Scaffold this active site. Sequence first.
Site, PDB file in Angstrom:
ATOM      1  N   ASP A  74     -15.617   3.004  15.472  1.00 21.85           N
ATOM      2  CA  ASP A  74     -15.070   1.865  15.560  1.00 21.85           C
ATOM      3  C   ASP A  74     -14.071   1.466  16.615  1.00 21.85           C
ATOM      4  O   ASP A  74     -13.671   0.419  16.729  1.00 21.85           O
ATOM      5  CB  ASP A  74     -14.433   1.873  14.087  1.00 21.85           C
ATOM      6  CG  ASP A  74     -15.552   1.929  13.008  1.00 21.85           C
ATOM      7  OD1 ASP A  74     -16.610   1.330  12.912  1.00 21.85           O
ATOM      8  OD2 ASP A  74     -15.029   2.827  12.034  1.00 21.85           O
TER       9      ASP A  74
ATOM     10  N   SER B  88      -7.942  -7.442  22.536  1.00 20.38           N
ATOM     11  CA  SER B  88      -9.234  -8.444  22.648  1.00 20.38           C
ATOM     12  C   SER B  88     -10.358  -7.299  22.621  1.00 20.38           C
ATOM     13  O   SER B  88     -10.141  -6.429  23.241  1.00 20.38           O
ATOM     14  CB  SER B  88      -8.947  -9.427  23.555  1.00 20.38           C
ATOM     15  OG  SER B  88      -8.754  -8.774  24.929  1.00 20.38           O
TER      16      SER B  88
ATOM     17  N   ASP C 278     -15.922  -9.980  10.823  1.00 20.81           N
ATOM     18  CA  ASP C 278     -14.612 -10.167  11.121  1.00 20.81           C
ATOM     19  C   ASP C 278     -14.593 -11.394  11.682  1.00 20.81           C
ATOM     20  O   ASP C 278     -13.803 -11.432  12.750  1.00 20.81           O
ATOM     21  CB  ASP C 278     -14.302  -9.044  12.071  1.00 20.81           C
ATOM     22  CG  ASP C 278     -12.758  -8.943  12.225  1.00 20.81           C
ATOM     23  OD1 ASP C 278     -12.255  -9.079  11.528  1.00 20.81           O
ATOM     24  OD2 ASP C 278     -12.435  -8.409  13.221  1.00 20.81           O
TER      25      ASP C 278
ATOM     26  N   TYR D 113     -22.917 -10.978  16.859  1.00 22.18           N
ATOM     27  CA  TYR D 113     -21.398 -10.438  16.914  1.00 22.18           C
ATOM     28  C   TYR D 113     -20.897 -10.679  18.228  1.00 22.18           C
ATOM     29  O   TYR D 113     -20.694  -9.780  18.962  1.00 22.18           O
ATOM     30  CB  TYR D 113     -21.183  -8.912  16.405  1.00 22.18           C
ATOM     31  CG  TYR D 113     -19.947  -8.523  16.295  1.00 22.18           C
ATOM     32  CD1 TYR D 113     -19.142  -9.059  15.635  1.00 22.18           C
ATOM     33  CD2 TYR D 113     -19.585  -7.389  16.952  1.00 22.18           C
ATOM     34  CE1 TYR D 113     -17.856  -8.636  15.334  1.00 22.18           C
ATOM     35  CE2 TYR D 113     -18.479  -6.687  16.909  1.00 22.18           C
ATOM     36  CZ  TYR D 113     -17.349  -7.260  15.999  1.00 22.18           C
ATOM     37  OH  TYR D 113     -16.195  -6.828  15.959  1.00 22.18           O
TER      38      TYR D 113
ATOM     39  N   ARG E 167     -13.335 -12.998  19.894  1.00 21.47           N
ATOM     40  CA  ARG E 167     -13.904 -12.239  18.969  1.00 21.47           C
ATOM     41  C   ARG E 167     -12.678 -11.323  18.248  1.00 21.47           C
ATOM     42  O   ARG E 167     -11.718 -10.994  18.910  1.00 21.47           O
ATOM     43  CB  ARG E 167     -14.685 -11.052  19.221  1.00 21.47           C
ATOM     44  CG  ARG E 167     -15.828 -10.569  18.395  1.00 21.47           C
ATOM     45  CD  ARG E 167     -17.076  -9.865  18.994  1.00 21.47           C
ATOM     46  NE  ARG E 167     -16.900  -8.639  19.666  1.00 21.47           N
ATOM     47  CZ  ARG E 167     -17.506  -8.144  20.494  1.00 21.47           C
ATOM     48  NH1 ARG E 167     -18.805  -8.384  20.522  1.00 21.47           N
ATOM     49  NH2 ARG E 167     -17.177  -7.075  21.070  1.00 21.47           N
ATOM     50  N   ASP E 168     -12.576 -11.197  16.902  1.00 21.49           N
ATOM     51  CA  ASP E 168     -11.723 -10.260  16.184  1.00 21.49           C
ATOM     52  C   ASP E 168     -10.326 -10.669  16.186  1.00 21.49           C
ATOM     53  O   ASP E 168      -9.561  -9.798  16.847  1.00 21.49           O
ATOM     54  CB  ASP E 168     -12.019  -8.807  16.537  1.00 21.49           C
ATOM     55  CG  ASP E 168     -13.497  -8.134  16.587  1.00 21.49           C
ATOM     56  OD1 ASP E 168     -13.929  -8.489  15.386  1.00 21.49           O
ATOM     57  OD2 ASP E 168     -14.195  -8.208  17.726  1.00 21.49           O
TER      58      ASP E 168
END
Length: 358
Positions: free
Chosen positions: A313, A95, A135, A83, A88-89
Amino acid sequence: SANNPWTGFQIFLSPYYANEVAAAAKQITDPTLSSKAASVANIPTFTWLDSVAKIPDLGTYLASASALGKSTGTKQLVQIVIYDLPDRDCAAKASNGEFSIANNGQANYENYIDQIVAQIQQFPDVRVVAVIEPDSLANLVTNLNVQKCANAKTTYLACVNYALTNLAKVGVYMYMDAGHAGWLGWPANLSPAAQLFTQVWQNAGKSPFIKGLATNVANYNALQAASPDPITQGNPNYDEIHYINALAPLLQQAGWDATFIVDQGRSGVQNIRQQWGDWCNIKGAGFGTRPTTNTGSQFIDSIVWVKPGGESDGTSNSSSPRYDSTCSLPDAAQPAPEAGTWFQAYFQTLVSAANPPL
């Protein structure tokens, strides 16, 4: 399929979660609930390799697993999440993550994979199962309108390909993240998803170590719900079993008899969301079905706990540079600390609301 990665192996239990859990259980005042909480450290979870800083932990876990197997007459299995994609995401608000496409992100990511491979290569008597990039690819199905995702598409595909291709060389059993029933399980998203996953599998050489897909990672859906959660209206695939039963044949037709793993670590309590897309620290969640290969489905190798319940989260503090407003919604538990860091109150409720009970 014939080869379920878990059968005949003992899962190495995360010492970090055991300690996170150990530190958490000592703060729970009711003695019955505190002992239940402590026992969560005996429930296997996935270790997130969310940064290069986590790679030395992987090395220690492999070496510890190797020794523990010899001490107990068992073969050991270490569970990890890959991950650390650049950008990312891509569809999230704000970010996160150490790598960016604009600053050598892909190259830095491939060095991250190389460092992981170099650890795994040293411990051939330990089996590894990896979830590949939660994700990520699911955004390339439904979120190509998000400019950050459109601009990340080639990098996500190249990086995931590099991970699959190189982890296969050290025999890692891999499940690509595939969202959840409310993301890719909509009937209209199934074929585009299957086409994407199959292209990724083809680009990585169709390795037998690419077992299939992981679903519901860090989410809250039921595996099998007797009644549909109202958030699911419009989608006949209202739980993970419906999603998987629908997606699997599309992969099989491509020559990939794919199998699945399903996160249930925060699925003990259904009907706790206003909207299906609400993902952050959902209030009232309970620990769900314990990890097991007794899944009830031809397609599902294991129920797993991928997201470690109790780790936040995301922060609810709108002044943090990492703030995502999803973490302030009415169905999000607040105040919440930074992502991946311990959220003690949330953990205690996960314990209290566990279903099946602990």
